[PDB]
Design a protein around this nucleic acid. Structure first.
Ligand SMILES: [Zn+2]
Ligand SMILES: [Zn+2]
Lengths: 814, 115, 62
RNA sequence: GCACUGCGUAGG
RNA sequence: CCUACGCGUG
């Protein structure tokens, strides 16, 4: 039958399923099952989960059992394997010891370790001087990395003398430095990992070293008590007054970081106020059973409950539409978008969804290669630091965060501090870490789902410093046309057609594909967010030193990745993920999307047989991919360039935040040379820790039709000036809901607002060319209602109800 | 500039007010006990907060956590002082029961003092 | 059609209830919000009418 | 009552 | 070129 094997020889290389006492299944089978997940084909995973007393067969009768979101109990089932996996790890170390004592040099693979932990391979072993044996464990540990966190193998370490039966180890609350424990864990488990491991990332040589140390620290942090992690504070005497001020930070991934300019002006007032230390010290203890996340303190005597009001109804527009024959019985066009009211427990409940963010440890070699490939996608952009006078803020009327929201908006704070003060604050952030508090609010939007949506507003200092750090790169990305990232490229004036033509650039057998990330913000692993931040900070090669960039990364982690979050006046600790108020929220999401796509491509290529591939070029490319992944430490620039060119030729991508549209070669995907939907599903399963459903994904065989959906808009080919052109049209239900339902009551009065309907008509004009008549009748209804509103209010305004103005907006003239 | 002075005064007043709300009897003990003088922030409210606020979603959670007039949490004994409802109405202890649970505006906010 | 007008009546009814300080009571507001949300997501006309009648009775009670 | 991106509207 | 009003990704 077929068994999973990680093979390396001149002929072929890769980790894939090959046709070919000792247990029936090996560790490689488990890792292949858990890294290449197919909902239809879970036979290996099911049997491994049944034979080793993880779950009974009846468990599989329940549907959505594999899904984490629908059935979180699966996390427990996988956890039942962890101990066994842990044992295997220990056994591996023992085996390696023997080899050093036997003077044996060889490579270690998952294929040779039964699930009982015994090693039954002595091949590829060359005898040498006793005591000089050096095993190769890059591939083994690298491939087994995700399962350790997924199965929670190291849970036993949280018990006294490393036994689950005996009670938990009780660490001193005051304790925070676990460097010795991290070194001990590394020496016990990854003793044969030659690369130096730094428990504190402040002593990392480069960004790749930081990523490696953070990857190990993510696993090591689960053992330590949760309360230890967080801001570090000390009491100091200022003006003869006690002040509790933060002097460091404990990161689950970056270890302990101590401020360099600790000492015992307006700038220092911001630094103190934004620090959660004073508020937490002055706040009463809080215990919340409504959520599984850690609760810090309560800053209010009473709990605060916020509700979402019902949407206002525009009677005039609905009556006008009804009189014109719309919204009849059986009509295709119907109201599917509304304002959905919510109770007082909604906000907290949505915060509880952060429970879906689990500690995730990534294949370090694979992640390093993927980030190296991704860096090519951002080479054309130019980035660096800018002074305060070069910072541009679109809107200043927004909130400054807590406690900054109490006293004023952003205008106040930006005017209060001169450019010199802002530069000094930026320099301080380049030398010290400033924890901040972010406030969660409920957004009042027209959604088609009963679920509530929240927006995170970060502190003013975080936004200001992140802007000064990244605005040059962000504007550079927004100012390019024809790149993979399509942020800043409008859909009007032929932008849609230009973008779509750019995607179709030279594909032998073009086929379109799309996807979305379930629970993208909540389930995003911390490691991938760190990788995205490092990628966006790589532009600071000349401007910023290693220490400055490390401290900027620490500030980003403490202000976005893991910060103090206020809900209803109560402070909580965010498990991880990406905040919605970050300066680089969209661009970090784009980097994450590109990283996931590259990882899916790499997994698809390696999972191929290799022998079956009849193309010498692709086989050699796969062999060199394995070389650069699990055999070469230094980055190979030539192969990185070759792989980037291969992806661009056979995998054109439009990436915006999390939405993506791919044009790929059908033959290569069929042969497994390029990633498919199943590869993305598996990637999200073993990395994003979320199950991806095929229902929400779409694949288009004909390029004429165009993408099924992108940016919530559909693509249609129309005829304009003897040229066939792609235009985007929206769902008529969304436009009609926007017209009928308004958030405020002033917008209900049509006379005051004649521009809302103008914008909605500018958006709905492409529907006029749809084969369905009602879709064009939507635009005609909007035009007629605009005319009626103008008449009620009563030459220029004529253009508003004449269709030439709306037609011109979709012509490539401008 | 006048608004800048107002903001400076505002943050100074807020910080000094928090200091007044802060106590040193236990804080100094913790700092002196600490070898380095640096302690995690989260433990400070745990080992120094005089008042504890507990949000209970349902009756089962109430029974599991704090049922009687006194309970144990964070390795400390807390005595019940007040039990308000979602409407901020003083719900009495006798009212809280499995039979009368449907008539209570959950969740319940329980305020207790360190013993 | 009856679906669109019943949904619109439910929306305006919840708006009136919100203006009536119904949100002061947690449980009553929760019931009203749940009924409204069910009405908007209702695909069967009879259930929509039943929930709309329930909301109208809630309004009439006060 | 957030981060950006894009598009109309009216005045310097 | 600058302000204010209005109208996609989290
Ligand atoms: Zn390092
Ligand atoms: Zn720089």
């Amino acid at each position: 039958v077929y068994r999973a094997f990680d093979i390396y020889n001149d002929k072929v290389a890769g980790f894939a399923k090959f046709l070919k006492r000792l247990t029936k299944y090996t560790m490689a089978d488990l890792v292949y099952a858990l890294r290449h997940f197919d909902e239809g084909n879970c036979d290996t995973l099911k049997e491994i989960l049944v034979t080793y007393n993880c779950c009974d067969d009846d468990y599989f009768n329940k549907k959505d059992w594999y899904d984490f979101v629908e059935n979180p109990d699966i996390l427990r089932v996988y956890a039942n394997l962890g101990e066994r996996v842990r044992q295997a790890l220990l056994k591996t170390v023992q085996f390696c010891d023997a080899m050093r004592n036997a003077g044996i040099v060889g490579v270690l693979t998952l294929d040779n370790q039964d699930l009982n932990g015994n090693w039954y391979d002595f091949g590829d072993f060359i005898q040498t001087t006793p005591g000089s044996g050096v095993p190769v464990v890059d591939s083994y540990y690298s491939l087994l990395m995700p399962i350790l966190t997924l199965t929670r193998a190291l849970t036993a370490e949280s018990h006294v003398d490393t036994d689950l039966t005996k009670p938990y180890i009780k660490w001193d609350l005051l304790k925070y430095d676990f460097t010795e424990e991290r070194l001990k864990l590394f020496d016990r488990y990854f003793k044969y990992w030659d690369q130096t491991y730094h428990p504190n990332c402040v002593n990392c040589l480069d960004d790749r070293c930081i990523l490696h140390c953070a990857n190990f620290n993510v696993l090591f942090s689960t053992v330590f008590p949760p309360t230890s992690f967080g801001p570090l504070v000390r009491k100091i005497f200022v003006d003869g007054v006690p002040f509790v001020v933060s002097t460091g930070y404990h990161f689950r991934e970056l270890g302990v970081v101590h401020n360099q300019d600790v000492n015992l002006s307006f700038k220092e007032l911001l630094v103190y106020a934004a620090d959660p230390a004073m508020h937490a010290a002055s706040g009463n203890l809080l215990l919340d059973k409504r959520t599984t996340c850690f609760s810090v303190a309560a800053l209010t005597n009473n709990v605060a409950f916020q509700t979402v009001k019902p949407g206002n109804f525009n009677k005039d527009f609905y009556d006008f539409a009804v009189s014109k024959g719309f919204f009849k019985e059986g009509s295709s066009v119907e109201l599917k978008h509304f304002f959905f009211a919510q109770d007082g427990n909604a906000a907290i409940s949505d915060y509880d969804y952060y429970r879906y963010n689990l500690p995730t440890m990534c294949d370090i070699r694979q992640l390093l290669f993927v980030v190296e490939v991704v860096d090519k996608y951002f080479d054309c952009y130019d980035g660096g630091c800018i002074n305060a006078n070069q910072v541009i803020v679109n809107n200043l009327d927004k909130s400054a965060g807590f406690p900054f929201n109490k006293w004023g908006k952003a205008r106040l704070y930006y005017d209060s501090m001169s450019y010199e003060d802002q530069d000094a604050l930026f320099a301080y952030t380049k030398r010290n870490v400033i924890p901040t508090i972010t406030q969660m609010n409920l957004k009042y939007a027209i959604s088609a789902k009963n679920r509530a949506r929240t927006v995170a507003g970060v502190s003013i200092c975080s936004t200001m410093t992140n802007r000064q750090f990244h605005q040059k790169l962000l504007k550079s990305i927004a100012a390019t046309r024809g790149a993979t990232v399509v942020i800043g490229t409008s859909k009007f004036y032929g932008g849609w057609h230009n973008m779509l033509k750019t995607v179709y650039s030279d594909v032998e057998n073009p086929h379109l594909m799309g996807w979305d990330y379930p629970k993208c913000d909540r389930a995003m692993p911390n490691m991938l967010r760190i990788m995205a931040s490092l990628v966006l900070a790589r532009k600071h090669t000349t401007c910023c030193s290693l220490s400055h960039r490390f401290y900027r990364l620490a500030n980003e982690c403490a202000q976005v990745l893991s910060e103090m979050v206020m809900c209803g006046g109560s402070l909580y600790v965010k498990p991880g993920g990406t905040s919605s108020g970050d300066a680089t929220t969209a661009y970090a999401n784009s980097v994450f999307n590109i990283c996931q796509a590259v990882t899916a491509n790499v997994n698809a290529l390696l999972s191929t047989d290799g022998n079956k591939i009849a193309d010498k070029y692709v086989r050699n490319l796969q062999h060199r991919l394995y070389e650069c992944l699990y055999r070469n430490r230094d980055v190979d620039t030539d192969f990185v360039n070759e792989f980037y060119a291969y992806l661009r030729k056979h995998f054109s991508m439009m990436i915006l935040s999390d939405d993506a549209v791919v044009c790929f070669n059908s033959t290569y995907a069929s042969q497994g040379l390029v990633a498919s939907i199943k590869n993305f599903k598996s990637v999200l399963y073993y990395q994003n820790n979320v199950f991806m459903s095929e229902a929400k994904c779409w694949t288009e065989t004909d390029l004429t039709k165009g993408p099924h959906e992108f940016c919530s808009q559909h693509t249609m080919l129309v005829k304009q000036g003897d040229d066939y052109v792609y235009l985007p049209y929206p769902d008529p239900s969304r436009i009609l809901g926007a017209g009928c339902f308004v958030d405020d009551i002033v917008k209900t009065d049509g006379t005051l607002m004649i521009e809302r309907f103008v914008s909605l008509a500018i958006d709905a004009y492409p529907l006029t060319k749809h084969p369905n008549q009602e879709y064009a009748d939507v635009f005609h209804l909007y035009l007629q209602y605009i005319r009626k509103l103008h008449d009620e209010l009563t030459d220029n305004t004529s253009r508003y109800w004449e269709p030439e103005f709306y037609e011109a907006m979709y012509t490539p003239h401008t | 500039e006048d608004k800048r002075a107002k903001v400076t005064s505002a943050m100074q007043t807020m910080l000094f007010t928090m200091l007044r709300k802060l106590d040193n009897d236990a804080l100094n003990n913790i700092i002196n006990n600490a070898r380095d003088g640096c302690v995690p922030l989260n433990i400070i409210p745990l080992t120094t907060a005089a008042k504890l606020m507990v949000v209970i979603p349902d009756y089962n959670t109430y029974k599991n956590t704090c049922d009687g007039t006194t309970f144990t949490y964070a390795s400390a004994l807390w005595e019940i002082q007040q039990v308000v409802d979602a409407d901020s109405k003083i719900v009495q202890l006798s009212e809280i029961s499995m039979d009368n649970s449907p008539n209570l505006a959950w969740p319940l906010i329980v305020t207790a003092l360190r013993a | 059609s009856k679906m669109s007008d019943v949904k619109c009546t439910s929306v305006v009814l919840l708006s009136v209830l919100q203006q009536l300080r119904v949100e002061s009571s947690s449980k009553l507001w929760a019931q009203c919000v749940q009924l409204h949300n069910d009405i908007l997501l209702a695909k069967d006309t009879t259930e929509a009418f039943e929930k709309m009648v329930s909301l109208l009775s809630v309004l009439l009670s006060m």
